[PDB]
Design a protein around this ligand. Structure first.
Ligand code: CA
Ligand code: CA
Ligand code: CA
Ligand code: CA
Ligand code: CA
Ligand code: CA
Ligand code: CA
Ligand code: CA
Ligand code: CA
Ligand code: CA
Ligand code: CA
Ligand code: CA
Ligand code: CL
Ligand code: MG
Ligand code: MG
Ligand code: MG
Length: 653
């Protein structure tokens, strides 16, 4: 019975949120909500006001650690929630800028009897809480999609004789004029109820009710509004049966790929399921090997009871080096505090050779890896601590510096370099040349290699060249007064460095609309050679492992678009890929996907062989979707981007 729903919902949410969230974080979040135009959630956090320990060296009090533990804070890009993991009862999922596809509940995880509240902020952008008059993006917002169910099941659904208050979403900034709430089934499956907090969305069990989500600060909605998207009960019809499909009932992601000297193709990423092995807990890292004819040779899965992913992989020709982050303690390792980075080595037969976990007392992220021609390995990432040297911002607001770490083939650390500004510097790229140097790239809110022309700390792209000993040879910075965002970098055979990303401004040319793609080239002496910019009127961007360069110095880019970039858009975002020559001429541009959300995440070219583009989807790409996100790999003709079947006349003279 919906009688006294208002009181029961408030008491249940308040009880769970105030039990789970540390008082430090409750204090911080109350201040955020009060500063914004959506204060409804603040009364649900009843812990005492507590000093926020922004710079504590105790990993249990360090506030970046605490905030990261209970949050998925995404990027300025239009993001899928590429970091979601079932490792806490309560999560704050924060999209920031861009048209974000926000999910927090894994329908394939065993969550029976578990308290689960996901607090969603679709935008709540930096400009709102760092108010600077005239900031280019002040007052801007985007269409965010809040995923509260899909074709398979409603999310947060306990299906018992209670009101189902133990699991629920709580969306705090839903704007019915722009955002979308995605739901399982059809409108007859739901009843909306006006409550003090706003709106309660109940699933009708036809004998009872179950709370799916609360919408703070919005009332008098209609289930007939176009801001609700209903997904039915049947899996999407399959397209692109030429693709290799990888998926479980849980969220499965390919985030990276590589090839070895024999032409075997590797992919890897994170999974909430049992993909390469039995799930250890929450998200695990995984990888898999295919021969050049498309037959899978093996799959492996590793990690901890906490959360980890493979974010990057690279080969020395035979072995497969993999890098990422963990919230736990990996095998034969010790935790440094909070989240750490790791590097691991797999041999060609799938044997895990070693794992090296490292970091500081506070938050590390690591998304990138490269292997040089001598077989040494470099990882890159960012840290709130003092990993390669003192953080630029020590205790007097905490922020990241970039780092690069160099290892030998046995995992011995040869050096670690750390660099940046007093404010945010994130790494999104690492690449060795053939002469002992290594490049790194990423984003900064500051003036690292140049004066930032943004008036409100908007991101610029940066590049650093390090020598064989980890000393900087130069720092470069480029951008517009708006946000410019780098995703990946790579070198060519001459040692020149290329970077790819997106921009909201006019970086290489006039912006066609929304996000556009760019490709920039610098020479080894730090001279900017050119920047190409291209796109549609809609949202176009590379994503994650967005560039690769083959032995002919052809450049390949990949990412997502919700426009008609390479062809007619199939629906939502699609994947795209493109090929360039070393002088920036675009050789071809292709687009592919399903009617549902798709994005490429990685591209690897085989020298004189096939091109592989891989990624993730909410649709049925390759075969029927098994649950939430599945992943895919496409084998392309590198000369024209045409898709080949993934699985594949002699004269005696
Ligand atoms: Ca975003
Ligand atoms: Ca957003
Ligand atoms: Ca929004
Ligand atoms: Ca529920
Ligand atoms: Ca795990
Ligand atoms: Ca750490
Ligand atoms: Ca910094
Ligand atoms: Ca900029
Ligand atoms: Ca565009
Ligand atoms: Ca790459
Ligand atoms: Ca699509
Ligand atoms: Ca799946
Ligand atoms: Cl970001
Ligand atoms: Mg019920
Ligand atoms: Mg098969
Ligand atoms: Mg390569």
């Amino acid at each position: 019975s919906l009688l006294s729903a208002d009181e029961k919902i408030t008491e249940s949410l308040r009880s769970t949120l105030s039990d789970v969230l540390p008082d430090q974080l409750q204090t911080y979040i109350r201040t955020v909500l009060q500063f914004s135009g959506r204060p409804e959630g603040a009364n649900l956090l009843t812990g005492p006001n507590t000093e926020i320990e922004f710079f504590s060296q105790d990993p249990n009090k360090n506030f970046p650690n605490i905030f990261a533990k209970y949050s998925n804070v995404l990027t300025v890009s239009s993001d899928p929630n590429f970091i979601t993991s079932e490792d806490e009862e309560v999560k704050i999922i924060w999209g920031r800028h861009g048209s974000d596809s926000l999910i927090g509940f894994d329908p394939g995880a065993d969550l029976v009897g578990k308290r689960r509240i996901d607090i969603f902020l679709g935008d709540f952008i930096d400009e709102q809480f760092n108010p600077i008059p005239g900031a280019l993006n002040a007052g801007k917002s985007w269409s965010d999609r809040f995923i509260l169910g899909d074709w398979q099941k409603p999310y947060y659904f306990e299906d018992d004789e209670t009101l189902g208050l133990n699991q629920s979403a709580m969306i705090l900034d839903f704007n019915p004029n722009e955002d979308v709430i995605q739901l399982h089934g059809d409108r007859q499956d739901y009843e909306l109820v006006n409550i003090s907090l706003g709106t309660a969305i109940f699933w009708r069990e036809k004998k009872g009710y179950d709370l799916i989500g609360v919408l703070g600060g919005v009332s008098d909605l209609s289930l007939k509004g176009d801001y609700f998207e209903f997904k039915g009960n049947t899996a999407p019809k399959t397209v692109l049966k030429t693709a290799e499909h990888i998926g479980t009932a849980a969220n499965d992601y390919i985030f990276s790929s590589t090839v070895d000297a024999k032409g075997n193709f590797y992919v890897g990423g994170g999974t909430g399921g049992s993909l390469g092995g039995r799930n250890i807990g929450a998200r695990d890292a995984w990888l898999a090997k295919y021969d050049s004819n498309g037959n899978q040779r093996w799959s492996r899965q590793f990690g901890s009871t906490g959360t980890e992913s493979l974010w990057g992989m690279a080969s020395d020709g035979s072995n497969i080096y993999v890098a990422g982050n963990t919230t736990g303690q990996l095998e034969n390792n010790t935790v440094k505090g909070g989240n750490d980075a790791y590097l691991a080595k797999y041999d060609s037969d799938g044997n895990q050779v070693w794992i090296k976990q490292n970091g500081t007392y506070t938050l590390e992220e690591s998304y990138k890896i490269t292997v040089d021609s001598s077989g040494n390995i470099y990882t890159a990432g960012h840290t709130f601590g003092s990993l390669g040297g003192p953080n630029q911002n020590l205790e007097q607001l905490p922020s990241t510096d970039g780092y690069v770490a160099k290892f030998d083939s046995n995992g011995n650390q040869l050096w670690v370099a750390q660099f940046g500004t007093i404010t945010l510097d994130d790494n999104w790229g690492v690449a060795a040349d053939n002469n002992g140097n290594v490049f790194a790239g990423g984003n900064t809110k500051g003036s690292f290699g140049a004066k930032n022309t943004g008036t409100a700390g908007e991101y610029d792209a940066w590049l650093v060249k390090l020598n064989k000993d980890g000393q900087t040879d130069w720092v470069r910075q480029f951008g517009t007064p708006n946000y410019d965002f780098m995703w990946d970098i790579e070198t060519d055979s001459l040692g020149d460095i290329y970077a790819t990303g997106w921009t909201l401004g006019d970086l290489g040319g006039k912006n066609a609309g929304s996000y556009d793609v760019w490709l920039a080239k610098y020479n080894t002496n730090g001279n900017q050679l050119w920047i190409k910019q291209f796109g549609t009127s809609e949202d176009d961007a590379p994503f994650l492992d967005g560039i690769d360069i083959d032995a002919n110095d052809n450049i390949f880019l990949t990412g997502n678009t919700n426009g008609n970039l390479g062809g007619a858009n199939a629906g939502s975002y699609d994947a795209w890929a493109a090929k360039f020559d070393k002088d920036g001429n675009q050789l071809w541009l292709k687009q592919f996907g399903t009617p549902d959300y798709d994005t490429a995440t990685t591209v690897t070219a085989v020298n004189f062989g096939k091109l592989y583009v891989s990624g993730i989807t909410e649709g049925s790409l390759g075969t029927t979707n098994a649950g939430s996100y599945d992943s895919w790999a496409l084998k392309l003709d590198a000369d024209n981007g045409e898709i080949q079947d993934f699985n594949s006349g002699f004269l005696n003279l």
